[PDB]
Amino acid sequence: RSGRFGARYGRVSRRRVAEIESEMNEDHACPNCGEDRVDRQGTGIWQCSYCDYKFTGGSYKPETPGGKTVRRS
Amino acid sequence: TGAGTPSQGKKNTTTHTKCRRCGEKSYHTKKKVCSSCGFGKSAKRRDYEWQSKAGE
Amino acid sequence: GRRIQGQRRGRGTSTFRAPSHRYKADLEHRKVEDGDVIAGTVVDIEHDPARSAPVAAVEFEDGDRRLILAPEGVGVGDELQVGVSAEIAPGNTLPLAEIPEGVPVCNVESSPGDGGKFARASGVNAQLLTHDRNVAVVKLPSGEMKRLDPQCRATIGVVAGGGRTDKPFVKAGNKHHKMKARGTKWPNVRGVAMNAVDHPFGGGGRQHPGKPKSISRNAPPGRKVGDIASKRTGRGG
Amino acid sequence: XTXPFXX
RNA sequence: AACGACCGUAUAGUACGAGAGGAACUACGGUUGGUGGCCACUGGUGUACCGGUUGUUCGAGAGAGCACGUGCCGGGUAGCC
RNA sequence: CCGAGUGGCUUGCUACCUCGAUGUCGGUUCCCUCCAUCCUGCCCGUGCAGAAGCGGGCAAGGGUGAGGUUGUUCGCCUAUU
RNA sequence: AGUCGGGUGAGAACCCCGACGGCCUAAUGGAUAAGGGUUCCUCAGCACUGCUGAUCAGCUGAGGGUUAGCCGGUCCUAAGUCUCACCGCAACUCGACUGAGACGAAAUGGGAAACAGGUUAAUAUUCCUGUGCCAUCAUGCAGUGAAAGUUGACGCCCUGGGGUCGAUCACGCCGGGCAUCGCCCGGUCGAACCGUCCAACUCCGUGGAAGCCGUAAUGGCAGGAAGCGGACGAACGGCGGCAUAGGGAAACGUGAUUCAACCUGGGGCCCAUGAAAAGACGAGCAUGAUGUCCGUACCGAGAACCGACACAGGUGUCCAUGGCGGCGAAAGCCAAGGCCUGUCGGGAGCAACCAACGUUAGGGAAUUCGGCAAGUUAGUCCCGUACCUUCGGAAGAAGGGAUGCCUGCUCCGGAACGGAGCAGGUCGCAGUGACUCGGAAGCUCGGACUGUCUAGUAACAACAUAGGUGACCGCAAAUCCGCAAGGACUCGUACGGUCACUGAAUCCUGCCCAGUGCAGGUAUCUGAACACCUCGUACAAGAGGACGAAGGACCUGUCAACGGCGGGGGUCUUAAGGUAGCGUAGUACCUUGCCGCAUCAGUAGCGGCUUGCAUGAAUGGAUUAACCAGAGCUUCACUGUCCCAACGUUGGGCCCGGUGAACUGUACAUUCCAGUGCGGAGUCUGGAGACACCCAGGGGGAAGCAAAGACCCUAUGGAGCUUUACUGCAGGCUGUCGCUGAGGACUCUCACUCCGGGAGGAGGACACCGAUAGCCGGGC
RNA sequence: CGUGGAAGUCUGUUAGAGUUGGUGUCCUACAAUACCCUCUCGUGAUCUAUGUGUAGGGGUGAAAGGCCCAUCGAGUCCGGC
Ligand SMILES: [Cl-]
Ligand SMILES: [Cl-]
Ligand SMILES: [Cl-]
Ligand SMILES: [Cl-]
Ligand SMILES: [K+]
Ligand SMILES: [Mg+2]
Ligand SMILES: [Mg+2]
Ligand SMILES: [Mg+2]
Ligand SMILES: [Mg+2]
Ligand SMILES: [Mg+2]
Ligand SMILES: [Mg+2]
Ligand SMILES: [Mg+2]
Ligand SMILES: [Mg+2]
Ligand SMILES: [Mg+2]
Ligand SMILES: [Mg+2]
Ligand SMILES: [Mg+2]
Ligand SMILES: [Mg+2]
Ligand SMILES: [Mg+2]
Ligand SMILES: [Mg+2]
Ligand SMILES: [Mg+2]
Ligand SMILES: [Mg+2]
Ligand SMILES: [Mg+2]
Ligand SMILES: [Mg+2]
Ligand SMILES: [Mg+2]
Ligand SMILES: [Mg+2]
Ligand SMILES: [Mg+2]
Ligand SMILES: [Mg+2]
Ligand SMILES: [Mg+2]
Ligand SMILES: [Mg+2]
Ligand SMILES: [Mg+2]
Ligand SMILES: [Mg+2]
Ligand SMILES: [Mg+2]
Ligand SMILES: [Mg+2]
Ligand SMILES: [Mg+2]
Ligand SMILES: [Mg+2]
Ligand SMILES: [Mg+2]
Ligand SMILES: [Mg+2]
Ligand SMILES: [Mg+2]
Ligand SMILES: [Mg+2]
Ligand SMILES: [Mg+2]
Ligand SMILES: [Mg+2]
Ligand SMILES: [Mg+2]
Ligand SMILES: [Mg+2]
Ligand SMILES: [Mg+2]
Ligand SMILES: [Mg+2]
Ligand SMILES: [Mg+2]
Ligand SMILES: [Mg+2]
Ligand SMILES: [Mg+2]
Ligand SMILES: [Mg+2]
Ligand SMILES: [Mg+2]
Ligand SMILES: [Mg+2]
Ligand SMILES: [Mg+2]
Ligand code: NA
Ligand code: NA
Ligand code: NA
Ligand code: NA
Ligand code: NA
Ligand code: NA
Ligand code: NA
Ligand code: NA
Ligand code: NA
Ligand code: NA
Ligand code: NA
Ligand code: NA
Ligand code: NA
Ligand code: NA
Ligand code: NA
Ligand code: NA
Ligand code: NA
Ligand code: NA
Ligand code: NA
Ligand code: NA
Ligand code: NA
Ligand code: NA
């Protein structure tokens, strides 16, 4: 995680990098199929290593609280 | 690094060259303008009154 | 003295310009004589250097290939539509008039046809509230209520890449790299750390501003620094 | 011009 | 300045003094600082020399070169100190 | 207390000398000197029994060392003398 | 870094041959870019140049020398540049935009095509021999396909597979070397091109896995896994030809390991997204013709470049795979190749003195501002490891042990000429035996960290940083550039970017709006010009009035805005009256404060107290792990820093041949002690001393040489900087006039503006622009 | 336990970059900023070649009034003179 930062940058900074990156690296349910196979391709880009679906999503998450709102209305 | 002798070593760039119009080695081959006659900038010849004493 | 930094800026030299020659596409809404019959298929999802956010490549029915300000959830294969009759789903672009109230919108036009102006940064989004035969009330991401022509076209959904600001840069090196893709001089030296000659706050035996930081709006460039026309300062009260 | 001659 | 000064012993547990305590002349031994000289002795050096030994090169052996002006290690004559 | 002086280390005063520059403080090294003498020699007095001192006289031959804090000079401190 | 012979010559230490001895190993070798410009080769020379000499030469003189369809240029496009047009400007050789065109890459971007040998004093993928290839066109045959697509064409980190050269190992052959042995060295060749082979990736069929397949790793699958079959498909690689070509005195090998080049995959990262165009492919074959123009010598550096020099400086790319060594592109040593030109020599055991340096007994920082300088430690393995800590770190903490050779072996692996161990034997004072190679520990201060800086006395605590906070702005924006035409931000849009402050984390950040600043409001007061009203004037100047914009008065908001946080008494100034903390501070005058630690002794250091001359909260306060060529202090270790100096080594120094400057010089000058003098005299005065000349020395004096004193003052000197100094100038805000139109509030559309491809939409007599007026106005 | 191989990460005269001490050598120098040893960085806010842009009250500046051809609190040249 933030282990790469050695004893630098102080708590908050690395604590947050670890968290964000932890969630970022989790198994994400593909919007197309349902397989937990979505991975970040870059800043805001995600893709299903299964069906290859490539889509826009959060910057560090594939789904942002804001996005989930659109759906509704 | 001294600005003196040691900084003289890198000076191997060619700029001012024999000018096609006036024959002076003042043609800046990177600027394509002659510092002497003005070839490349002015159709007229580069000339200023300050190149001599006011009353002359 | 010497022109302060803000003055060197205006001159538009290299140091201060954006590496435009490295930018992908001036994201702007398409044009349609009318009808709305226009629609294309998402072909790819790229990284937009100018906005540190993803953008989508699209091929339209009339074989037109262009990059588009991508909302969230737009994936390859998806079919977007741009027109008065365009469906009411995320990704589609249509005049506010046709958009139902309460729907999150992004890349809104100021004047109809300008191709989008408001809400285009990572994860932001406007908010359509009021309909009228005359005015469409949009609540911009800054929280301001903007009165717009119901003919101004806008895209449904929120901009992609949201939450980008949540992770700290942590190290100068990370700013460096990002900064290098914008029209900005970085790093930043505080006036107070400069010589009197270089900035109104320069000089002294110790570091401190030589006057109150709040400057008048009517101040001339070269002297307008610090807190510009501040209605107030601090966090208290 | 800098204290001792000529530092 | 070619010499300056100090400690110790005998004098004497004496003169003196209630006691406590406690000298001197003189003769001795030594120390310190300074001075001039010298090298038997001790010590240093001693890239004179002899030996051990690592790397490498001359095929091995033998015998050598280089490793900063001896590769390092051990011993060390004269002389100089 | 008051009064009379010598010195030219301190400080102050003056503005004579140098502003076409006479290189700073402290330290260091190396040489000569002064006496208003700390020790050493020879002496006087003693509130000088002795021992240890206290004060003074002649006297500049020799000596007057090592360290802890401090850039310090100065000074404070330690153990030797 | 030379030495002995010898050569040439009028002349030889340094020109040439040989031998012996050395030096250079990412360079002192090889190929080159820029730059130089004939320095290249040859012959003849020595007046010049060469740190001495010269027969030599980058010198002088005269000749000669650079050969390309397939190496570069040329072509393409990059940041960006110019030209024309348009517009601006008093104007231009000026100026931003827009449109069109052109320019912009010689090592090192993209790119049609060449290899091998031979040759000259000097060129060489250029000439010659052999062989091959590309393009265009022409003719003939085929073909009617033909433009969609592919390619050119791409970041960073890790990694697998294919694989050549090289290197090494085994054995054979050819040639050499060595001489107790049987070893050691070199060689054992052979291209472009043509043909052919194909692993990886992708896909297809078959198959039918419900747990298997697979990797260095990740991974894969009923949406179809393994296996089998197949389509597509790689090398500068293999294989065949090329080649009874070439090359070699000869032999003119075969296998293997590790494998640069080259080929092809997999994984990971981005608040960073990693060129473009020409061109190629797509799209056959034969024969013939054509392929012009420019560069090509040489140097590429301790003598051919820049630095005034044959300058110890500076100056890009490729050779990173030669051997031993070892982790290594490290040291040390040695090839290939280069060199003895980092170009003056000869002589003295060669003194003093100086530069680099070795070794010094006993002591061991006593030296000193300070351990400055030097020294100690050191490689690898095993054991073991404190406080503190942000849990990462601290940490190689510290500390202890081991370490060679020789004999025979074991384990890992396909194997290495890879690695890890075992038993026995054995030498030395010493086994990382040289070389390579940390001294260690603690306390306090500062800045969080990596990073930045005064090119040439400052590397630091200064700057930056992430992080924290405040301010401005909805884009026809805020901010900024331009005289204008116009422009940066901006292919951007509040998760933005402008303007500032603070400066990681951690616990926190009190009180004050009185002054100043900024901003909002405002009955009333003050507030310019035009128009308007009165007076005045046959008109006019002019005087007064009415209305009143911004602004000010006044009011309010605001301190993570400038800044403030006391005296007195049991409020006063001027708003408040110092909260948490910290405290004799890098802030404390008094001061070496007092007490304690530590030492024989401690203006130091650390801790406590602390009334703080004159601490204190984003002018950030406290505190803090890690980090540091940062400041202070303590300990162990170590030592010529010191007691106290000695001896030694090399280069000078000294003598000799040759070369050969400069600084400085009013004159006189063998001085010394005193005195005098504008008070700091070799020269005046009095005495003393004093025969001349020369060598070496360390520098006492010549207020030594070098610099018209920086300090200080003065001059109605200069400049940079500041401000509520004087005066002005931009700029911003605001009223008014013009553009400007119809019906103190209001409608419209037609100028004008803006959005829109257009149709048309928004806006609209405003805004913009021109003119003027008031206010703000160190931005200048 | 292994695999993996992150990092403005560590050691490092790899290349390359930098410039702390010696206040050494030099100081009519080899040199108008050099030499030697010592020292810092060395996968990144890295170093570097070439091409290109910014011009003088203007640039450029992680800010030292640093730099803009040995020239900088306002470059250089000529002119005003
Ligand atoms: Cl940013
Ligand atoms: Cl003592
Ligand atoms: Cl070429
Ligand atoms: Cl793989
Ligand atoms: K003076
Ligand atoms: Mg300069
Ligand atoms: Mg755009
Ligand atoms: Mg932020
Ligand atoms: Mg930039
Ligand atoms: Mg800053
Ligand atoms: Mg400053
Ligand atoms: Mg100013
Ligand atoms: Mg500050
Ligand atoms: Mg000065
Ligand atoms: Mg030797
Ligand atoms: Mg050793
Ligand atoms: Mg003098
Ligand atoms: Mg007397
Ligand atoms: Mg005497
Ligand atoms: Mg000749
Ligand atoms: Mg020649
Ligand atoms: Mg071109
Ligand atoms: Mg090329
Ligand atoms: Mg040649
Ligand atoms: Mg050639
Ligand atoms: Mg030379
Ligand atoms: Mg000793
Ligand atoms: Mg001491
Ligand atoms: Mg002492
Ligand atoms: Mg040292
Ligand atoms: Mg095995
Ligand atoms: Mg202190
Ligand atoms: Mg720091
Ligand atoms: Mg400096
Ligand atoms: Mg430093
Ligand atoms: Mg320095
Ligand atoms: Mg900040
Ligand atoms: Mg900030
Ligand atoms: Mg700071
Ligand atoms: Mg204290
Ligand atoms: Mg506060
Ligand atoms: Mg401050
Ligand atoms: Mg006389
Ligand atoms: Mg003067
Ligand atoms: Mg002054
Ligand atoms: Mg002035
Ligand atoms: Mg427009
Ligand atoms: Mg001024
Ligand atoms: Mg690092
Ligand atoms: Mg390093
Ligand atoms: Mg450049
Ligand atoms: Mg300053
Ligand atoms: Na200031
Ligand atoms: Na007197
Ligand atoms: Na006096
Ligand atoms: Na004088
Ligand atoms: Na002195
Ligand atoms: Na005496
Ligand atoms: Na003392
Ligand atoms: Na082949
Ligand atoms: Na090797
Ligand atoms: Na010579
Ligand atoms: Na670093
Ligand atoms: Na106030
Ligand atoms: Na106020
Ligand atoms: Na304060
Ligand atoms: Na650092
Ligand atoms: Na020594
Ligand atoms: Na002298
Ligand atoms: Na000035
Ligand atoms: Na693991
Ligand atoms: Na240095
Ligand atoms: Na100027
Ligand atoms: Na003049």
Swiss-Prot record, chain A:
Annotated GO MF terms? large ribosomal subunit rRNA binding; structural constituent of ribosome; zinc ion binding
Recite the UniProt keywords alphabetically.
Metal-binding, Ribonucleoprotein, Ribosomal protein, RNA-binding, rRNA-binding, Zinc, Zinc-finger
Q: List GO terms (cellular component aspect).
A: ribonucleoprotein complex; ribosome
The protein's required cofactor(s) are namely: Zn(2+)
Listed under GO biological process in this entry are: translation
C4-type Zn finger ranges = 30-51
Report the superkingdom from the record.
Archaea
Q: Where Zn(2+) is bound, by residue?
A: 30, 33, 48, 51
Co-factor binding comment: Binds 1 zinc ion per subunit.
What's this protein's family per the entry?
Answer: Belongs to the eukaryotic ribosomal protein eL43 family. Putative zinc-binding subfamily.
Function field:
Binds to the 23S rRNA.
Oligomeric state and interaction partners are given as:
Part of the 50S ribosomal subunit. Contacts protein L2.
What name goes with this protein? Large ribosomal subunit protein eL43
* Name of encoding gene: rpl37ae
Summarize which stretch of the complete protein this chain spans: 11 to 82 of 92
Curated annotation (Swiss-Prot), chain B:
Keywords for this entry? Metal-binding, Ribonucleoprotein, Ribosomal protein, RNA-binding, rRNA-binding, Zinc, Zinc-finger
Q: Which residues bind Zn(2+)?
A: 19, 22, 34, 37
Provide the species name: Haloarcula marismortui (strain ATCC 43049 / DSM 3752 / JCM 8966 / VKM B-1809)
Keyword Cell inner membrane attached = no
Give the record's subunit note. Answer: Part of the 50S ribosomal subunit. Interacts weakly with protein L4.
Task: Sum up the protein's function in the record's words.
Answer: Binds to the 23S rRNA.
Record note on cofactor = Binds 1 zinc ion per subunit.
Output this protein's name.
Large ribosomal subunit protein eL37
Q: Which Gene3D superfamilies match?
A: 2.20.25.30
GO terms for cellular component? cytosolic large ribosomal subunit
The record's PANTHER family line, in alphabetical order, gives: 60S RIBOSOMAL PROTEIN L37, RIBOSOMAL PROTEIN L37
Write the lineage as a comma-separated list.
Answer: Archaea, Methanobacteriati, Methanobacteriota, Stenosarchaea group, Halobacteria
Q: Which Pfam families match?
A: Ribosomal_L37e
Swiss-Prot record, chain C:
Recorded hits in InterPro entries, A to Z, give:
NA-bd_OB-fold, Rib_uL2_dom2, Ribosomal_uL2, Ribosomal_uL2_arc_euk, Ribosomal_uL2_C, Ribosomal_uL2_CS, Ribosomal_uL2_dom3, Ribosomal_uL2_RNA-bd_dom
Q: Give GO cellular component annotations, separated by semicolons.
A: cytosolic large ribosomal subunit
Q: What are the GO MF terms of this UniProt record?
A: rRNA binding; structural constituent of ribosome
Region feature (Disordered): 199-237
Q: Which cysteines are joined by disulfide bonds?
A: none
NCBIfam families reported for this sequence? PRK09612.1 (NF007180)
Indicate the family of this protein. Belongs to the universal ribosomal protein uL2 family.
Subunit and partners:
Part of the 50S ribosomal subunit. Forms a bridge to the 30S subunit in the 70S ribosome. Interacts weakly with protein L37Ae.
Q: What else is known?
A: This protein can be partially incorporated into E.coli polysomes in vivo, indicating it can replace the endogenous protein.
What is the name of the protein in this document? Large ribosomal subunit protein uL2
Organism name: Haloarcula marismortui (strain ATCC 43049 / DSM 3752 / JCM 8966 / VKM B-1809) (Halobacterium marismortui)
Gene it is expressed from: rpl2
